[PDB]
Amino acid sequence: YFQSMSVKGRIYSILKQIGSGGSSKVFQVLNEKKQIYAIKYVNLEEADNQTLDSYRNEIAYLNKLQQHSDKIIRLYDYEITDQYIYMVMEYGNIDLNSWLKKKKSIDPWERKSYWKNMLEAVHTIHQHGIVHSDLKPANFLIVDGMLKLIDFGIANQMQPDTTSQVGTVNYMPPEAIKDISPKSDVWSLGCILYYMTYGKTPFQQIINQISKLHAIIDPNHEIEFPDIPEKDLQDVLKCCLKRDPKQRISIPELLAHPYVQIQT
Numbered sequence: 024y025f026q027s028m029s030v031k032g033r034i035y036s037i038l039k040q041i042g043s044g045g046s047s048k049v050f051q052v053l054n055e056k057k058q059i060y061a062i063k064y065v066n067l068e069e070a071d072n073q074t075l076d077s078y079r080n081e082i083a084y085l086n087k088l089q090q091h092s093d094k095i096i097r098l099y100d101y102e103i104t105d106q107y108i109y110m111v112m113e114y115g116n117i118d119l120n121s122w123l124k125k126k127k128s129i130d131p132w133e134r135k136s137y138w139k140n141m142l143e144a145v146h147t148i149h150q151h152g153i154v155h156s157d158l159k160p161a162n163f164l165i166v167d168g169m170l171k172l173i174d175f176g177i178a179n180q181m182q183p184d185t186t187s188q189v190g191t192v193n194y195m196p197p198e199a200i201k202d203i204s205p206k207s208d209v210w211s212l213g214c215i216l217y218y219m220t221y222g223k224t225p226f227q228q229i230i231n232q233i234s235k236l237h238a239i240i241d242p243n244h245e246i247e248f249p250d251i252p253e254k255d256l257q258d259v260l261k262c263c264l265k266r267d268p269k270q271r272i273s274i275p276e277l278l279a280h281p282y283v284q285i286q287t
């Protein structure tokens with residue numbers, strides 16, 4: 024308690040830590056006017072030039088792309104030095120991953136609204152040549168019912184190093200396993216929707232990771248799509264989770280899909 028920090032001359036009161044990973048921490052904070060933000064702190068002391076560049080590149084894209092869609096998290100300010108980065112970001116209620124863990128059933132409307140938000144954010148980054156390639160529910164922040172994409176997958180994650188469902192392959196596409204395309208983000212989004220529809224990711228039940236990786240790529244391993252009242256949702260899932268990326272549906276196609284367009 025009673026910690027503060029400064030970012031471009033502005034003093035922020037730290038209320039609590041709300042996340043961490045790699046060599047970074049996220050803080051719920053207040054500025055001088057008692058407006059709430061999240062500050063993301065990245066420790067750069069161990070970073071090589073390649074890693075420093077990947078962080079610079081991500082900050083530049085995030086700062087640019089927030090003006091192109093409200094489904095991308097706001098970045099209000101940042102301070103960047105050799106030792107660290109402080110990013111003053113939009114505050115959210117909770118991330119999507121934690122929310123889905125709390126909820127047994129998701130409301131069909133809620134599920135559809137979240138889907139629309141994700142497609143729009145991801146479509147935005149693709150329009151600027153960015154493939155995320157590691158989309159999971161944790162990459163989305165819920166802000167007053169609206170999803171915001173938190174990151175673009177450009178920054179190279181540094182290792183924990185210090186004393187101090189992680190690195191999961193459940194959202195990984197076939198083409199990523201056999202060793203880059205916007206279709207890769209479609210598979211991952213499809214895995215998120217699949218989770219929101221049937222309460223688990225398509226290959227979740229396979230505990231052995233080698234088996235699971237083989238199941239992702241094996242075209243004889245049929246993915247189950249049990250019947251549900253929303254036949255358009257069932258179709259979206261089937262189209263996202265085609266193993267051949269060339270046969271897989273595109274984001275502009277998903278945006279014109281009756282699941283997102285037809286007023287039910």
Ligand SMILES: CCc1cccc(CC)c1NC(=O)c1nn(C)c2c1CCc1cnc(Nc3ccc(N4CCN(C)CC4)cc3OC)nc1-2
Nearest residue numbers: 041042043044047061113114115116117118121161162173
């Ligand atoms: C996944 C993206 C990523 C990639 C690399 C490095 C990092 C930093 C750890 C990240 N993570 C973040 O960049 C990040 N993580 N979180 C939690 C936030 C961010 C960015 C900004 C942000 C804004 N508002 C929130 N709110 C929030 C989220 C989760 C929670 N919790 C509390 C602990 N529970 C066990 C789970 C749920 C609480 C929150 O606010 C009170 N939360 C956040």
Ligand SMILES: [Cl-]
Nearest residue numbers: 089090092093
């Ligand atoms: Cl905007």
